[PDB]
């Protein structure tokens, strides 16, 4: 029986799995999107505020 070091798989080695794993975007149950129910002006629709091109790209 070849005398393999018993600890060869116990010692920490940086695996390909660890290097290649892509992080998932985890969030708290409310997803960090606070729905404001205190200030009534927060969702008040001002007809003079035009949509910015940066928001338009998200809506396209």
């Amino acid at each position: 029986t070849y005398p393999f070091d018993q600890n060869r798989f116990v010692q920490y080695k940086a695996t390909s799995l660890e290097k290649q794993h892509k992080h998932d975007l985890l969030t708290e149950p409310d997803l960090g999107v606070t729905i404001d129910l205190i200030n009534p002006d927060t969702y008040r629709i001002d007809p003079n505020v035009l949509l910015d091109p940066a928001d338009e790209k998200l809506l396209e």
Partner: protein
């Protein structure tokens, strides 16, 4: 120009005291004035809301609590203002409960909000703002998502362009994984009101990420930070997007984004977990442990706790504290999601240290089932099964080691282990395997041939 003023009518007289919103006096005096003059409740609420916009939350809290006792109700629709007072105070306590670190204070805040909502039920049980408050409150408890869905649906049936109801539906749809519905609700909200909060783009960003729409996700998080520079959630989103690029410049960007998030909120679990991972690569295990332990205590999300446990276990693993590493890997496997198999690899290694090759094999099989044809997992599982008495396991080991040697022909150990398995059924295969190992040792490792290999070749 000044932000505005509010009129306080003096009792039984035509005289009025004008309070400037830019020079509002101390709340205890305002409460005393409003109480002595028996001022109507809408004024108490309006003042509290102005204090709130200015960040003067202590005066806002004092005013609404005092208003419940001394706010004069001798006017039309005072009941709607009572509802507004109770729902605003309950919603604020819910927001605090979301921000509160002490579980006892959090439970007390939740109890107070519940009591306030139960009191409001006796005034106007089906008010739209009341229903929005209760639906948003159900999300903190988590088990009442179906009730929140029904309540948001009722509000949308009366006002289908209601931004809070659309955001509520979007959040529930996202938790139920209906990312297209969630994105559609967020898009409708932003299309209806261009002046929406920055957080509306954050939700869109999360939907784009889950829909693999990385460009729109990056734009959404950047736009959220452009509108609200304190948006930690957007910094985390961008950091995750940059870290996932695997490029050196993106990795650096991710670390910079995380550092900015840490300077804004040093208690955020996502920021702490990614910073722990970064310091791990920098070998600063003291920071890894400090950050991961604090992160573990700062969240109730099992998937985040599992990642914190994995960071902890990996730090103890490098420190050779195989028992604590085992405990944290084990806990991580208990908390781990169906996609997070990294804890099983570490646990498998600790089972090897403990000699429990059967559970180690099960751990590595779980990893291999998630990541098929992975070199390290096939090598370890092959090695573990090679020593097994079951002939099928020996055949499995033979298959895995064949794949390992085909992918990495320079791994001497994989060739030796394969040779030891082949000795039983294919003498020529075993000879070829030992010959290859011998050749690699002599030509590439330039080391003398071990006597065991020479003996086995002789046999």
């Amino acid at each position: 120009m000044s932000r505005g003023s509010i009129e306080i009518p003096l009792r039984d007289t035509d005289e009025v005291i004008e309070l400037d919103f830019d020079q509002l006096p101390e709340g205890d005096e305002v409460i005393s004035i409003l109480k002595q003059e028996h001022t109507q409740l809408h004024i108490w609420i309006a003042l509290a809301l102005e204090y709130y916009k200015q960040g003067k939350t202590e005066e806002f809290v004092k005013l609404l609590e005092a208003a419940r006792i001394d706010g004069n109700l001798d006017y039309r629709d005072h009941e709607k203002d009572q509802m507004t007072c109770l729902d605003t105070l309950a919603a604020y306590y819910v927001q605090q409960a979301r921000k509160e670190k002490n579980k006892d204070n959090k439970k007390d805040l939740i109890t107070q909000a519940t009591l306030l909502y139960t009191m409001a039920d006796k005034i106007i049980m089906y008010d739209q703002n009341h229903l929005l408050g209760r639906a948003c409150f159900c999300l903190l408890e988590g088990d009442k998502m179906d009730q929140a869905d029904a309540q948001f649906h009722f509000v949308l049936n009366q006002s289908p362009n209601n931004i809070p109801a659309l955001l509520g539906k979007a959040c529930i749809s996202f938790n139920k994984k209906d990312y297209r519905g969630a994105l559609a609700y967020y898009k409708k909200a932003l299309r209806t009101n261009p002046g929406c909060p920055a957080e509306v783009r954050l939700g869109m960003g999360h939907c784009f990420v889950k829909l693999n729409k990385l460009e729109k996700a990056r734009l959404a998080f950047s736009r959220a930070l452009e509108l609200n520079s304190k948006c930690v959630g957007a910094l985390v989103g961008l950091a995750v997007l940059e870290l996932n690029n695997k490029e050196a410049d993106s990795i650096k960007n991710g670390v910079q984004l995380l550092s900015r998030a840490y300077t804004i909120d040093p208690s955020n679990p996502m920021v702490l977990n990614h910073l722990a991972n970064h310091f791990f690569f920098k070998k600063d295990y003291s920071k890894v442990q400090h950050l991961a332990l604090h992160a573990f205590h700062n969240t109730e999300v099992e998937a985040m706790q599992a990642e914190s446990c994995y960071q902890l276990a990996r730090s103890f693993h490098v420190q050779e504290d195989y028992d604590q590493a085992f405990q944290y890997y084990y806990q991580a496997t208990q908390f781990a999601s169906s996609s997070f198999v990294l804890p099983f690899f570490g646990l498998g290694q600790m089972y090897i240290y403990r000699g429990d090759k059967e559970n180690a094999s099960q751990c590595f099989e779980k990893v291999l089932k998630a990541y098929p044809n992975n070199y390290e997992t096939m090598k370890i599982l092959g090695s573990l099964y090679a020593a097994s008495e079951d002939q099928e396991k020996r055949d499995i080991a033979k298959g895995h080691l064949k794949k390992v040697t085909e992918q990495y022909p320079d791994d001497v150990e994989a060739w030796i282990e394969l040779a030891q398995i082949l000795e039983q059924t294919d003498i020529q295969g075993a000879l070829s395997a030992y010959g290859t190992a011998t050749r690699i040792l002599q030509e590439k490792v330039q080391a003398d041939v071990p006597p065991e290999i020479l003996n086995n070749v002789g046999a």
